[PDB]
Design a protein around this ligand. Structure first.
Ligand SMILES: [Zn+2]
Length: 197
């Protein structure tokens, strides 16, 4: 009833990476290593790097799913709020209820789990292109953390799983997400709060 969040590199040495975008007031997406937390604006591009030590088999896939970070909310499906699920901002593939989209990938598939009702998005794993050392996916988060009737100020985690063609686990990583108006200022504030503690 709760997806695992245990980091697992697996046989291929799978792990995520993030750009170093800084904390200027104008930044639209920024990652805090100290907090393991991504801060981003609503519906903006969030680059997430996929790193491996060796190339997994053809048919490997990459899935993203959100869960509530606090244990007392972990069994509740993370979904878009009653406003945003009705705002007709569809991209043609993502159901309007899904918080996480992978943008610019025509092979993205969106799953409503028939048993858990949880949402996820899954794309084929592509090995890095010539001259690159990693593969980058571009995620969008389609509600603010503060959206009433949705996340409702509750922190979430994104879990990224590397899966075989049957959906079996090959690797797992995760990060907290805050979707907010000013990611640069919020990252600075939370990093200062951590330093004071
Ligand atoms: Zn919303």
């Amino acid at each position: 009833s709760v997806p695992s969040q245990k980091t697992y590199q697996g046989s291929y040495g799978f792990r995520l990476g993030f750009l170093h975008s800084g904390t200027a007031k104008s930044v639209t997406c920024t990652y805090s290593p100290a907090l393991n937390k991504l801060f981003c604006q609503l519906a903006k591009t969030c680059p997430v790097q996929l790193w491996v030590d060796s190339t997994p088999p053809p048919g490997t896939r990459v899935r993203a799913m959100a869960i509530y970070k606090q244990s007392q909310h972990m069994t509740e499906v993370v979904r878009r709020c009653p406003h945003h699920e009705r705002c007709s901002d569809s991209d043609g593939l993502a159901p309007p209820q899904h918080l996480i989209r992978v943008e610019g990938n025509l092979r993205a598939e969106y799953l409503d789990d028939r048993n858990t009702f949880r949402h996820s998005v899954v794309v084929p794993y592509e090995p890095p292109e010539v001259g690159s050392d990693c593969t980058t996916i571009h995620c969008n988060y389609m509600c603010y953390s503060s959206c009433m009737g949705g996340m409702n100020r509750r922190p979430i985690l994104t879990i990224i799983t590397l899966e075989d063609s049957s959906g079996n686990l090959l690797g797992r990583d995760s990060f907290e997400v805050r979707v907010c108006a000013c990611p640069g200022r919020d990252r600075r504030t939370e990093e200062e709060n951590l330093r004071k503690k």
